[PDB]
Symmetry: C2
Subunit: 93 residues, 2 copies
């Protein structure tokens, strides 16, 4: 069988399924940034930013680390960077 | 600006955001099939299948043609076939 690979692809799709959330990906691509910085750069309040970052994380698209009172997020790997580039190609059509 | 490329990537993500809908993509990859056949192969009723095919179409992932009383769907291009392969790689993690 193919599953439960497809349920996780579904989680990838869910993570991608918000246009404003995709701004975060462009911002992190490339260079890890703190939540505060990501919120400020995208004009999102801290709650919205953190919710969207969680959504990206559940889809396996970003990783996080805690340093002091801050949290730093980055694009999870090259495959994710290739994926985000290619989905923009597909979208461009 | 990047948009409204990102709103369409969001539509791509939305199309991908259903695990059972992704079975359709595996089925069509590769070889175009009629709605009836896709419904039967995936165990979906005709309404569910057609709804899921519409969802795939809005995300630019499949194309359709009408032949008589039937409708045939296929994967929209190579970039979509590469995309679906790569998202499974990303998901596999």
């Amino acid at each position: 069988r193919k599953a439960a690979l497809l349920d996780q692809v579904a989680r990838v799709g869910k993570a991608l399924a918000n246009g404003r959330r995709l701004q975060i990906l462009d911002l992190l691509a490339q260079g890890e940034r703190a939540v505060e910085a990501i919120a400020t750069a995208t004009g999102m309040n801290l709650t919205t930013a953190s919710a969207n970052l969680q959504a990206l994380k559940s889809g396996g698209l970003v990783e996080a680390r805690r340093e002091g009172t801050r949290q730093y997020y980055r694009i999870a790997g090259e495959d994710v960077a290739r994926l985000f580039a290619l989905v923009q190609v597909v979208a461009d059509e």
